[PDB]
Amino acid sequence: GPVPSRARVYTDVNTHRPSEYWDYESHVVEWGNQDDYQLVRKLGRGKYSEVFEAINITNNEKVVVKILKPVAAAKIKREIKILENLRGGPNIITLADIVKDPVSRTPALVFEHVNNTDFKQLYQTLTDYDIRFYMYEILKALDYCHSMGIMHRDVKPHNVMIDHEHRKLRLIDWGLAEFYHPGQEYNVRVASRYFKGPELLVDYQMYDYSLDMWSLGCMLASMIFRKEPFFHGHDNYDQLVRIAKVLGTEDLYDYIDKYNIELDPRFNDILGRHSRKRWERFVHSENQHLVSPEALDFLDKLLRYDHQSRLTAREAMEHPYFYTVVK
Numbered sequence: 481g482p483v484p485s486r487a488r489v490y491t492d493v494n495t496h497r498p499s500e501y502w503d504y505e506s507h508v509v510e511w512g513n514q515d516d517y518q519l520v521r522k523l524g525r526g527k528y529s530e531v532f533e534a535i536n537i538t539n540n541e542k543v544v545v546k547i548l549k550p551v552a553a554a555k556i557k558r559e560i561k562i563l564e565n566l567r568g569g570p571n572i573i574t575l576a577d578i579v580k581d582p583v584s585r586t587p588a589l590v591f592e593h594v595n596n597t598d599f600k601q602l603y604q605t606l607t608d609y610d611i612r613f614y615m616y617e618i619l620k621a622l623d624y625c626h627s628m629g630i631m632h633r634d635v636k637p638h639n640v641m642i643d644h645e646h647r648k649l650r651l652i653d654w655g656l657a658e659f660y661h662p663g664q665e666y667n668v669r670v671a672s673r674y675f676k677g678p679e680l681l682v683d684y685q686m687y688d689y690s691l692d693m694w695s696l697g698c699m700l701a702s703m704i705f706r707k708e709p710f711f712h713g714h715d716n717y718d719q720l721v722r723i724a725k726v727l728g729t730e731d732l733y734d735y736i737d738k739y740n741i742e743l744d745p746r747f748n749d750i751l752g753r754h755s756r757k758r759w760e761r762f763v764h765s766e767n768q769h770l771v772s773p774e775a776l777d778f779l780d781k782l783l784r785y786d787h788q789s790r791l792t793a794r795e796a797m798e799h800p801y802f803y804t805v806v807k
């Protein structure tokens with residue numbers, strides 16, 4: 481069968497911490513008062529929740545209320561526990577309260593308010609300097625949650641709120657986050673298609689924090705090359721083929737051979753043979769202002785098939801790409 485794998489970092493964090501830390505099922509939720517909050521406007525709705533701008537009428541502060549849907553309701557303890565464990569961490573969204581929505585009869589998570597700049601404005605106007613600055617801010621959040629034994633598993637632009645006016649960033653939506661336990665087999669049906677790591681696409685279940693580093697690399701590649709999304713698969717199978725047209729099929733075969741993974745035979749009719757492409761191939765006059773030898777070298781070290789070979793968040797923070805960023 482497949483060869484087991486374990487993270488090269490933070491392998492023991494959930495061992496060194498008491499069971500109360502990671503055993504979310506045993507966690508008792510201390511409910512607040514739903515009447516403290518007045519809903520102002522609906523901000524959006526996803527697969528698992530409906531998000532609203534609200535006012536905490538007790539202290540007159542702006543908040544965000546996330547009313548979980550019934551499907552999300554079963555796994556709320558995991559999200560709550562993770563949010564409470566990470567509260568106060570750098571660039572981690574702050575959970576302010578947990579109440580029971582009167583109408584939905586489900587839990588509603590109350591967060592600090594962040595004024596998020598629209599995607600278009602950020603995607604189209606962030607400078608090379610801003611990209612390095614915000615990438616470093618995301619790395620602070622990822623090294624914090626990884627060091628705390630948690631993998632986000634849904635790193636993508638929709639889950640990164642940026643208040644550009646105040647140069648403030650928060651990593652949000654911890655609904656898909658999990659505690660990392662060495663040897664544990666995890667559901668591969670996590671992350672949005674374009675951000676899914678090769679481990680998910682080849683059905684390798686014993687993955688870890690490094691999945692977040694692949695997703696981060698996908699966001700960086702799209703941003704610096706002006707190619708949104710970078711790996712534009714039509715489905716989960718074509719997703720791996722799009723990756724292979726860049727990274728090459730030889731390193732993909734070395735990866736699955738290392739972990740004794742068998743590719744799904746449906747790949748025989750679509751994968752083909754592809755050489756590894758040099759990152760300079762994606763450079764052109766419309767993205768040259770965002771590219772540098774340091775950016776390409778950084779990207780190269782995140783976007784690797786072998787989840788054990790990618791830079792960790794802490795190593796990534798040491799990279800020359802961030803030398804220009806004011807610390």
Ligand SMILES: COc1ccc(C(F)(F)F)cc1-c1ccc(CN)cc1Cl
Binds near residue numbers: 596603604642
């Ligand atoms: C492809 O998206 C990104 C890619 C890289 C970066 C960063 F390098 F600056 F950190 C930010 C975004 C982004 C992150 C979040 C949003 C809006 N929620 C918008 C954008 Cl453009």
